[PDB]
Design a protein around this ligand. Structure first.
Ligand SMILES: CCOC(=O)c1cc(O)c(O)c(O)c1
Length: 470
């Protein structure tokens, strides 16, 4: 209610400790902070964790109370609700280990709970479909910036972090700072009166650009007709972490036909983005999906392989790599993708029967799920509507990057694993190139043999953050 002034009080911080690399990391915690005045779901609270030195007038890793970066990680996956995280949390989902390491590095951590597609209110009504996820992230950022000074940390050094759907959340926060689109939702929540533009973005395998992801996926995997993925099993564990089992299939003749069309359409979509390489040449694809953009994808995988090769990793785990002497000199991209295997069927994202997590994300209070592409709406196997065009645009980080804007974070670090088949490599690559093209700082790679995952390179992530902030 209005009695919640959204004023942080350092008096709330209580001393705790956690082991990191066999040493004690002392910190202070304040949990369960209601970050808006009119919440609709219990999950909308945030936790604050502060290196202990900052309450005793001292330094960690070149930072002090007033200057420390504020890391804002999220636990969003599958566009599902992402509860407020905690270095002591063991319940799934959690990136508790990352919070522990961040505290050791001297970062203040503000871990916010975020509504997701399955969130319901006290009455059983859905209140967490798009754009709830990004509205909550923005509201949490506004709470932090409103409380600049009161909260330890530099509110002008907010760095979001997330994996997969959570990576898209982090990226969207960096892309869409102070966008007027979200103002009515934030007003209705009673968010703090502050801005929500942030300093830097960390994003692992961001599952974004959803309305073009079906095209990208088929451009990549057309010609590969068996798929392999996971679906759950039963089971009751103490950590609440969903247990999965493999399930495989083969594309129907009809799916294969749809694939060829989707792949063909990708060329036109890609070309009209007007992406450029460093020397300024347009990155394109021809009718058959070959060309300079495809060569960029290949080159990134060669770079990935070279890095691993230099480490003594056997890159011939997968097919297609040509090694001459000590150099990975080429790559048969088709052979690599065949050895990596296709994960998702066709369409991969906008399923014709409305059964995907993205279909459910785009539902609302009336409809559990919606389509978000013309193709799937036309070929729908169930009665369905298309989601609002402005909403699809609003939650895509690319929509904000047609320009060199003061509201977009200046500093980006994106990773997508070389063994991650949850979306096409083209998807994070398009984000990365668009960022560079518009003069933003972008640190990008496809790390060798890394699956769908995040937070696996903390040493390098933190070194990057420290390079920006110290
Ligand atoms: C479930 C793992 O990661 C995700 O966040 C995620 C979300 C999606 O919407 C996907 O389509 C996906 O493959 C992964």
């Amino acid at each position: 209610s209005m009695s919640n002034r959204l004023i942080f009080d350092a008096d709330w911080l209580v001393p705790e400790q956690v082991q990191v690399a066999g040493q004690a990391i002392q910190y202070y915690a304040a949990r369960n902070i209601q970050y808006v005045q009119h919440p609709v779901a219990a999950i909308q609270v945030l936790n604050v964790f502060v290196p202990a030195a900052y309450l005793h007038g001292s330094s960690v890793n070149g930072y002090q109370r007033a200057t420390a970066p504020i890391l804002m990680p999220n636990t969003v996956g599958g566009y599902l609700p992402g509860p407020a995280d905690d270095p002591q949390r063991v319940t799934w989902p959690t990136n508790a280990g990352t919070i522990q390491q961040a505290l050791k590095r001297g970062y203040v951590v503000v871990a916010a709970g975020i509504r997701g597609r399955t969130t319901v209110d006290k009455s059983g009504q859905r209140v967490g479909q798009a754009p709830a996820f990004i509205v909550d992230m923005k509201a949490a950022i506004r709470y932090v910036k409103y409380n600049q000074g009161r909260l330890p940390g530099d509110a002008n050094r907010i760095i979001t972090n997330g994996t997969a759907a959570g990576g898209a959340t982090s990226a969207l926060a960096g892309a869409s700072g102070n966008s007027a689109y979200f103002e009515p939702a934030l007003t209705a929540l009673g968010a703090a009166p502050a801005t929500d533009d942030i300093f830097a973005v960390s994003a692992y395998c961001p599952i974004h650009n959803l309305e073009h992801a079906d095209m990208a996926y088929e451009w990549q995997f057309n010609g590969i007709n068996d798929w392999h993925r996971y679906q759950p099993v039963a089971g009751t564990t103490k950590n609440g972490r969903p247990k999965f089992e493999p399930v495989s299939g083969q594309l129907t003749v009809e799916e294969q036909a749809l694939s060829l069309a989707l792949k063909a359409q990708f060329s036109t979509y890609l070309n009209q983005l007007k992406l450029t390489a460093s020397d300024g040449t347009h990155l394109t694809l021809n009718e058959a999906g070959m060309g300079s953009f495809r060569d960029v994808v290949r080159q990134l995988l060669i770079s990935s392989a070279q890095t691993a090769f230099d480490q003594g990793t056997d890159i011939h785990k997968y097919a297609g790599f040509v090694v001459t002497g000590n150099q990975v000199t080429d790559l048969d991209l088709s052979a690599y993708l065949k050895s990596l295997t296709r994960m998702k069927a066709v369409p991969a994202f906008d399923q014709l029967d409305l059964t995907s997590p993205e279909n459910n994300l785009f539902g609302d209070a009336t409809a559990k799920a919606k389509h978000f592409t013309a193709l799937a709406q036309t070929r729908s196997t169930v009665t369905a509507q298309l989601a609002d065009a402005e909403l699809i645009q609003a939650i895509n980080p690319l929509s904000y990057l047609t320009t060199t804007s003061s509201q977009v974070a200046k500093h980006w670090r994106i990773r997508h694993g070389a063994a991650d088949r949850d979306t096409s490599f083209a998807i994070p690559i398009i984000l990365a190139i668009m960022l560079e093209n518009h003069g933003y700082g972008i640190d990008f790679a496809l790390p060798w043999d890394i699956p769908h995952s995040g937070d696996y390179d903390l040493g390098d992530l933190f070194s990057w953050i420290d390079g920006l902030c110290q």
